[PDB]
């Protein structure tokens, strides 16, 4: 055990060393980006040793190495959890981050602040490990809110761009609503179970868990960008491409899904929550998949692809398969990150041109990015025996052979068809055909940083699922017997998508005219949710703050009913008692009145 | 960003290289000062396509308030060199 503990915490400490050494400037600049990459590289291999110890002996432990606060009967201590989810996810996060940072050393070479950029990437990675490794809600909330800020700082990287600040603040807004659910979960646990540690919560096993679980579901909604709080993720693509690959593709958006996985001992007994989670994901995995069928910007297509995958992860939690949802997180990290790097490689070649309508003929020009792009798409769609097959197909198998909502089941299958459409849309509009990019372009991809960074993920996006699948300890009863037409639903669904997608592309090249429709403009405009909500809600709330809250009340009616009326009255009485001519004839008559009144009305003389 | 910096000669050569591929101008008489309208008898509706063939070459939009003002392939060269920060 002494080795399991020491190597687990050194992984977290190692990542923090570059931050500490950048506080007192005890290093040499212009090598910092390579300094950070090496720390991630070494952090990865160290994390494997605890992982192997888990794979071998199934050994887990909890470390409470500090006593921070004690609120009467509540004790808050810095605790770390090293179990199935912690040990499995950490190596993948480091492995993908390793590749992303090496790519960044190429992609962001000309950026003046490339030093600060790497520090921010490292800071997010640290907070994501706090979130994943947290053993109590308060410690979980530290990472939960930390990643949201690092998302704010990296999205708004080019702060001169008005639209980067709007996208950055928008991400904070939507997540803050989710945090409302997180707080509700924390408040309910304290008053009902008198704890925040996950050890005591599971031991007591509450029965009336509808309220806290709804809170956690709401928190998972905002962070994973499900329907209702979806719009921010597609708009998070304002940030530099390396940020998109790491945070908003593989290792931040999954945090919402991850939170619901850690509470599976509760949701397993609460079918009502399983109903909402199943339905909430089903609408997202279909609506977002629908939006991608017509997007032109290359990053936004992958951004919506991420949302659809996230929805499918929530459906899996909804159908009471917590481990399969986690298995999709691990696999999804590999190939989803690769597509962004492949896309980023294309964008730089064509001089910051992100529109697929202005690309093409790159199948032969960029063979390495082409092969990487192809391998990723086949992994995403669920090509057999790749990384995405060992998790996505098991998910579709478990959905059909389960007591599941019929409509939610249908949306998952339809959305799978759309997976093969926009994927083909990128391949067809970015590799085949004839060039549409400008005449003078330097299509070069020979930088060793680019190849080696991708070449590490290309290996992962092939045998990542195969290895993890055959090594994780069993935790369920897999449903391996079912009708043939269900066992091969995804294959037929996916293959029909390619064929249906293939024909749609060819009809474009014909010289027929174009007829706009109400289904093309509905998907192109994201369903109208951003156009309406981002204009209506800000207008209503902002106007109220001025007309009602600020002017009507504070500047008018709170002044009128106390400072003003009280003050005005004294001024009025001040004129009455001082509007005196100065005549003896009239003063002394008052004295006569006072004496008479003192005896008749008041009887002061007796 | 790893691209080759533009040059005054490079701008001029490419600008004329686009015009040489347009069927409504004779390459023989095409000089830097050949006014598109008076010296070549091209209607304004052609001039619009001329500019559109340039901004698709250098890949940067030119506002209409200024594009219509360009009536000489030297002005296009001067306009781009001034808007791309080229001096030699």
């Amino acid at each position: 055990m002494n080795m399991f503990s020491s190597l687990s915490l050194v992984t977290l400490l190692l990542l923090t060393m570059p931050i500490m050494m950048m506080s007192f400037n005890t290093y040499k600049p212009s090598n910092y980006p390579l300094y950070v990459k090496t720390a991630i590289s070494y952090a990865f291999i160290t994390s494997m040793i605890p992982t192997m110890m888990f794979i071998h002996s199934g050994q887990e432990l909890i470390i409470s190495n500090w006593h921070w606060l004690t609120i009467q009967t509540l004790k808050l201590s810095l605790s770390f959890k090293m179990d199935y989810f912690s040990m499995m996810f950490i190596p993948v996060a480091l492995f993908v981050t390793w590749s992303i940072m090496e790519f960044s050393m190429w992609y962001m070479y000309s950026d003046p602040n490339i030093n600060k950029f790497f520090k921010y990437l490292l800071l997010f990675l640290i907070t994501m490990l706090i979130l994943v490794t947290a053993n109590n809600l308060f410690q979980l909330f530290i990472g939960w809110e930390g990643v949201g800020i690092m998302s704010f700082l990296l999205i708004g990287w080019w702060y001169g761009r008005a639209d980067a600040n709007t996208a950055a603040l928008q991400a904070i807004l939507y997540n803050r609503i989710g945090d409302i659910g997180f707080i509700l979960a924390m408040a309910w646990f304290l008053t009902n179970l008198n704890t925040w540690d996950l050890q005591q919560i599971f031991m007591l096993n509450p029965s009336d868990s509808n309220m806290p679980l709804i809170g956690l579901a709401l928190a998972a909604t905002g962070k994973s960008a499900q329907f209702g709080l979806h719009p921010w993720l597609p708009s998070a693509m304002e940030g530099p491409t390396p940020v998109s690959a790491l945070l908003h593709s593989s290792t931040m958006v999954v945090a919402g899904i991850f939170l619901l996985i850690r509470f599976y001992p509760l949701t397993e007994n609460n079918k009502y929550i399983q109903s909402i989670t199943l339905c909430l994901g089903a609408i997202t995995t279909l609506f977002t998949a629908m939006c991608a069928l017509t997007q032109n910007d290359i990053k936004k297509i992958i951004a919506f692809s991420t949302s659809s995958q996230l929805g499918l992860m929530m459906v899996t939690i909804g159908i009471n398969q917590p481990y399969l949802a986690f298995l999709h997180i691990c696999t999804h990290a590999f190939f989803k990150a690769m597509l962004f790097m492949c896309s980023g490689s294309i964008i730089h070649s064509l001089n910051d041109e992100q529109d697929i309508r202005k690309m093409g003929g790159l199948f032969k020009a960029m063979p390495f990015t082409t092969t990487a792009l192809i391998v990723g798409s086949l992994a995403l769609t669920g090509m057999p025996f790749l990384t995405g097959f060992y998790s996505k197909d098991l998910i579709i198998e478990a959905a059909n052979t389960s007591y599941t909502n019929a409509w939610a089941l249908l949306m998952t299958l339809i959305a799978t068809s759309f997976t093969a459409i926009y994927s083909t849309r990128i391949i067809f509009f970015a590799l085949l055909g004839q060039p549409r990019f400008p005449t003078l372009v330097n299509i070069n991809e020979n930088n060793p940083l680019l190849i080696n960074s991708i070449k590490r993920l290309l290996i992962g996006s092939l045998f990542a699922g195969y290895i993890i699948s055959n090594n994780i300890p069993p935790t369920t009863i897999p449903q391996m017997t079912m009708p043939y037409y269900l066992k091969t639903t995804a294959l037929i669904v996916t293959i029909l998508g390619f064929i249906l997608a293939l024909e749609i592309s060819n009809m474009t090249k014909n010289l027929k005219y174009h007829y706009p429709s109400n289904a093309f403009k509905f998907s192109t405009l994201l369903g109208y949710f951003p156009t309406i909500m981002h204009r209506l809600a800000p207008y209503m709330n902002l106007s109220m703050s001025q007309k009602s809250a600020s002017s009507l009340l504070d500047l008018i009616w709170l002044e009128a009913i106390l400072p003003k009326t009280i003050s005005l009255a004294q001024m009025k009485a001040s004129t009455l008692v001082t509007n005196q001519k100065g005549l003896i004839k009239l003063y002394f008559l008052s004295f006569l009145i006072t004496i008479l009144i003192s005896m008749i009305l008041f009887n002061f003389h007796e | 960003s790893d691209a080759p910096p533009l040059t005054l000669e490079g701008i001029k050569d490419r600008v004329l290289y686009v015009l040489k591929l347009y069927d409504k101008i004779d390459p023989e008489k095409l000089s830097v000062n050949s006014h598109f309208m008076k010296d070549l008898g091209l209607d304004s509706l052609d001039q619009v396509e001329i500019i559109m063939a340039m901004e698709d070459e250098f890949g940067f939009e030119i506002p209409d308030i200024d594009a219509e003002k360009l009536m000489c392939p030297q002005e296009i060269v001067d306009y781009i060199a001034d808007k791309k920060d080229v001096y030699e």
Partner: peptide
Amino acid sequence: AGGGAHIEPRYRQFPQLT
């Protein structure tokens, strides 16, 4: 951006490959 081999750009031609 920086490092590795160097490929001279070409105009209206298939880019040079290694």
